[PDB]
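Researcher: Batch entry, complex prediction.
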Amino acid sequence: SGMERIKELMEMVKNSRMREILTTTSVDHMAVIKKYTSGRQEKNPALRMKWMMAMKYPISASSRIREMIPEKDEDGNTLWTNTKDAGSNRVLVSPNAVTWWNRAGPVSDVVHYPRVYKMYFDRLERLTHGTFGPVKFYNQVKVRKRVDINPGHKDLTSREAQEVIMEVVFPNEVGARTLSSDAQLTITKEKKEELKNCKISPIMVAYMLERELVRRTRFLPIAGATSSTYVEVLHLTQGTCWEQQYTPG
Amino acid sequence: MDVNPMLIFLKVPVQNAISTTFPYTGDPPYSHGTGTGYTMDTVIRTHDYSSRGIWKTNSETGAQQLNPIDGPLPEDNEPSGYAQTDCVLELIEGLDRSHPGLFETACQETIDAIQQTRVDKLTQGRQTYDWTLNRNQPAATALANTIEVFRKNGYKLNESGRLIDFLKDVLLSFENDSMEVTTHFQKKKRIRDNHSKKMITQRTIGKKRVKLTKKNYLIRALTLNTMTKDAERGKLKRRAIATPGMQIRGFVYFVELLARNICERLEQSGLPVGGNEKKAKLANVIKKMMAKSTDEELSYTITGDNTKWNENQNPRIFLAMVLRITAGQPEWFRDLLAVAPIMFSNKVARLGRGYMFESKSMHLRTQISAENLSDINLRYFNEDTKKKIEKIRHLMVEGTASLSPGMMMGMFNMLSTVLGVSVLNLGQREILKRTYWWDGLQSSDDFALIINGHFKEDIQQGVNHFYRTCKLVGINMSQKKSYINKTGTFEFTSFFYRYGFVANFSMELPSFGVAGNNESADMSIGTTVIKTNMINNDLGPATAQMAIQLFIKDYRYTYRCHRGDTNLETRRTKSIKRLWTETISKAGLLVADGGPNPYNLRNLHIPEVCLKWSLMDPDYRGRLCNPNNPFVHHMEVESTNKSLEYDAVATTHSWTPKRNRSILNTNQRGILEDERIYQKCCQVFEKFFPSSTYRRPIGMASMLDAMLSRARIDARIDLESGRISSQDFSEITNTCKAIEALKRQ
Amino acid sequence: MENFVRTNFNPMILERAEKTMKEYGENPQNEGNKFAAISTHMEVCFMYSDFHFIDLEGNTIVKENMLKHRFEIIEGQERNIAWTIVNSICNMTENSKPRFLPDLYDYKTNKFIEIGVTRRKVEDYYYEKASKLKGENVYIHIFSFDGEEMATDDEYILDEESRARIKTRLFVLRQELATAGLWDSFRQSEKLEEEFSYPPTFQRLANQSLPPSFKDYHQFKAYVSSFKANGNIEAKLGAMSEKVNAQIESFDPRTIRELELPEGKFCTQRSKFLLMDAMKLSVLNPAHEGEGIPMKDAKACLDTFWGWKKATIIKKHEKGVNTNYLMIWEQLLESIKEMEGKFLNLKKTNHLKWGLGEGQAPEKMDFEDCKEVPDLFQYKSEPPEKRKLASWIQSEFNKASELTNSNWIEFDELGNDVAPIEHIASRRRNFFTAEVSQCRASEYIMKAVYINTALLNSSCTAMEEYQVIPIITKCRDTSGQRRTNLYGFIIKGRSHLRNDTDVVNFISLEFSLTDPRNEIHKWEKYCVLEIGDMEIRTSISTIMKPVYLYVRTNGTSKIKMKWGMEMRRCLLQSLQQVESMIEAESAVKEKDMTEPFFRNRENDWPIGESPQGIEKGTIGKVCRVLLAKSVFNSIYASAQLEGFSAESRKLLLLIQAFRDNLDPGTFDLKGLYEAIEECIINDPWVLLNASWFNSFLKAVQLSMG
RNA sequence: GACGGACACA
RNA sequence: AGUAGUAACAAGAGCAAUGUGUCCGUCUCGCCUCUGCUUCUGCU
Ligand SMILES: O=C(O)c1cn(CC2(n3ccc4cccnc43)CCCC2)cc(O)c1=O
Ligand SMILES: [Mg+2]
Ligand SMILES: [Mg+2]
Ligand SMILES: [Mg+2]
Ligand SMILES: [Mg+2]
Ligand SMILES: [Mg+2]
Ligand SMILES: [Mg+2]
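Model: Structure tokens for the complex:
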């Protein structure tokens, strides 16, 4: 509970080049040297995926796959191979190993997809219980205006919600700022209660909280209702010459 | 019957079928080989449109510098760079008078952003000219190399972490008489290819230490590197673009931030707005200029473009503009913003890769770089390049050409926009006080100009007044690309207005298809592109359903994930067939697992795992969204909550493809080691500061001091709360003492 | 001063003081008395916290040497590090954050301590610092050089021994600030700008960045700062020559000329595969072993032909070695006869090396190892030679717009329709599929997709080999039966592609029934062999036609292969246009116009020119014509087409503004014609589009007669 | 916040 | 020869993808060349 990382830091400061980096680079300069790179960079990822999936092992994954997925399939397909390097902890994976996991891997009782992506399930519940009217044909007069694509929380702005997120997920990292609104205090209290003993990683919890609390706005051509439940089905309810009558669930 | 598609324009108006004029299903033009010819072309053209100006020899670099400002007024309609300082100052003063408080507000916002901007803002760039390598690098790599050379030569103000202190270091670094930099050198080795049995040159990239003299360092700090713009549509011929180094980018950032704050509050600026907001702005200026009219008043729109916009802008005019906009501001702020026009006035353009040369008698080719092109005898160049070399020889310094006039492609977009908007602002009827008046919108060189008047001769006089004023400030309207008609239809940057903006779907054609990230991300990208184009680009519902079908076909080919009941056979048909057979509810299987396409028009906004979730088998759902997902990355659990890892959320189709950074016959381990050591240091930092990937941590203390302070306070809090014993606490504090002792030694 | 501070203080205190001053952005010279004050404050903060421990029970031990300190020192830490400490302490308990950074935290009392040091009065400095810290749960403690303390309400949480030691230290420091002379200023300093100057090299650069009537940067800044305009623009416009004008020329398309098309030899065919002249060898409902694998499909399609004879050259490639092409066909045939495994790799023979350009590049060397070569000349950069428009490309475009008997695009299935708009879209989409899927341009789409896919997979997986790649399409017939078609073969060359534009050379060998000797300028790059005879049964009389093989070296790159694989997006560009026309009438009639557009046969759209004049066709013919236009934009993509489409769009818009009665004008119509005709060089599709524009212009002028 | 893609102008 | 088109490829460093702006998606690992790893390409 804190001794592992300090022993690792001692092992790194034993190296002189690592010590020179860690003592001469400040926290501000770590944002620079984190994005440092020196090799040539590969462009055109769509073309590269077109010819890479004709290969046998386009996927790279951790060495832990060697304990989790068998080397060969029942059909005879080799599911993974060791990398070209001499002593890396990495493998090259066939897409048959992804298919092997999805048909015969270990079945977990708990999954985290409906909690984390609850906003999309709410969109789906509004669509599944939606009511369609008739389509009327006439000339649609669309005014380009700023509407909400994500309503956020009613009591917060986007910046207030971002401060709420930093308080809920990373409370020792917020620095000098304080939650200057009782809405921020109540929503921070509620979300800190909801997320006790969370197995989900903190960056995923932060993005989940961004999808819940933060309002996003966009400039869109709008013919009718400008509410956020109607902006998400804008492709469905309006076109150039037609209007689909729709009430969300 | 010989079929002619253009005869559909006999019935359908041109804007309503404008997609049939954009051939965007074919490959765009790419250049081959070097961009040195286009660089010399731009340098020749820039010095030719300014040729009646004053020549000077720069005392600090030795370069020949052409000054066309306040030169002779033009006598023809050719492109001129003879901008008059007083006419620019009158236009900027009139723009200030028409918008009271605009310059003060924008300058104070720029002042508030200067004091808060960190150095790593300069890592927003793409391929930067790296002066330490004399070569292009990514922006963070070039910034890190510049900061390391600055700290090795005693320039340590940038250790505060603010961008303005780095800029002070940049300006102070020009007093150095001998800069010592780390360069790359190659050792060459002749070996045999074991496969092809052929003697090839093997290359190993090392690190060397070289000295730059004061003049050579100053020439490199003022260098813009150049290359050809690839995949550009709508042109027969190519042109060069430019990339500046890190000594210029920080100043250009603050100048463009001031100009963005001005442009954001001007009704006649088309920047920084874009997309639907730019269309709303153009529609508002059309509706306003067609309201303000009597029954006896004509309205005419110029669909306008300018000839050689970046080559006729001048850094001295930008200097006068920045000093006028900041009049009444603190002199540190005025002097800081004046640096980027002064640097562009003394800029040199790096000529590029050189040319390829060929011996027919020895059957060899060799690239001769831009450093070595000056020592090549003239008779070996071809005819056009011999002409270009001859009229460039007095400009050539150290593999670069001097280029005092011009701003190069897109270096000061918002400031040249402000100049054009000042000319558009001149035509208010209360100020102009004649029979004509004008209005419109400008973004970069593109403009719409609405001229109103009582007679057509008033329209001609207004067009002449606008055109000659633009000529006075170095703006040359393209006569062969501009046209005029009555207000009601125009074009602006491939937005076609015909009593309203029409759709141009063909421009969105290169975005349809499989994106090549992984199976899951590409599924979301494809359905979102179809949804966005239904909303914005008037993609009809039948064509949207066909877009869904074509995307699913291309997707099932690419990841070889055809349906489980297919007669096809790929490398993974047997495993997908096994999954298909034992699955009870096959409608819950994802498309990457051989399942059906669930998408129609109504559910394009719902992701694929959520849309199929209620139809999944429990075993398939437990496998697919297994939190022990071996294909995705797992964060370690921190110290405020073999080893503990967090549960995964993403499905097993969120794998990462393998990467290939390798260069032919090249060993780059000696330069790829630094990136790996950096990534190890930044990985050990995030074990102490878990929000470091979410939000960038700030601080002037070193990484080690921060990690030791966090370790000590974490151990004390965990001891005070009963998570660790006193033995663990004393162990951690003695470990921090040992790390401090190793730091001192 | 500073050496006073460096002599009277410790190393650690001085280091933390200098680090604090460096963090705020000053030095121990510009504020030296403040450096002494910072070192004094740091010394007092350390003397508050030295030797103060808390036991394993919960009570303090004031030691003098496994115990934990009583105080967390927040002073002297970096600001973000200090706020990390303060947030961690405030979240261990539930106490409120202080709005300012304190100096200490006491773990025994659990209180944030603020240490002050003053030279005025302890009472008034205490009142002023409590005015600063109003409304917090802090604990202030003020020392002075008088030797006096004042805490919060005199409820002291530090013992009298260490407080006496701190007072003794401050009294001694006062009595040492007088034994040198530096004291009366220290009592008067209680409680900043932004500099940015030019160093002299950059100041000399700034003096050379001016308008040429100025010599110093500050003189020009003083000129700009005091500028008042006085009609400078009006005076310069009066003095500017009146040849500078944007004189408007009235645009009337009845008086404008046609585009000049270039002269020279005829344009030749440059598609990567044969189009209208292509011949299929098909298998109906394929069920052979290895079905689906391309070379097994190719052998099954080659088995359907039984009329092979000895191949003879009947039309030479005038620049090539044509016997090499004949030998390449003989080698390919014999190797298909005896192939093992899944893929066929050809032995690199001399004729096959010639056809694939092996060893044609000069060997790349470094210029260090090349300076003494006496004949190193630069690579040439010649423009393309002009070509005349030939009539074959219009025939190709007529055939591409036509319906075939086979279904060429197999669309994948959709999700079920629930919304009424999805039922309407399905109704319209079935008409679109009934027009688009049987078009010849759809066959060209599927041919290009298959060829570019196979060439890209072979170029990346078999880079050293000479792979044989069958030209395969698959269709369904009228009765829904599957059919697999072979059009010939491609022999790929070496493919070590590093740049985006890097060419892989290949050889195409394509079956045809078209005699090349009847239109020979179309076939300039080809060597056509006669390889067989085939019985063709018509309604006139069945005959024996010769089967020809069109052989040529061609080359492609990865960007061309990428855009050839994406050619099904051509189907979008057509149908979105067609649907938008159906939508526009649907907005007027207030009902769905899909079924009256596709059922009421009327010939309602100009798409053609016969000798009788402008020809009209249905909305389905318009679908197929726009599809063939997109397909031919993809097959014959070039920079000439980009430049031509861009610059002739302006002329189309000027014609449209004339017909809208919007009174259009130009400033330089001749220069626009030169920009359009600069792009019409030798590409047959660009030449056909320039001809099509001339025909549209003539039709517009005739509609104004 | 980081990485990627598409478009537009320079 | 052929691709192509203002200069290249036709193997032997890919040392040549900017600025500004809009829209959209994703989320911390991988990458390494004498070799060390794989021989792959099937769109009814
Ligand atoms: O900043 C603090 O924590 C702090 C600062 N002082 C003011 C002084 N000081 C110390 C660092 C510093 C930085 C900027 C301005 N004044 C600063 C201390 C001596 C000279 C002035 C007094 C306290 O009692 C504090 O607790
Ligand atoms: Mg222009
Ligand atoms: Mg333009
Ligand atoms: Mg303090
Ligand atoms: Mg204090
Ligand atoms: Mg992009
Ligand atoms: Mg040639």
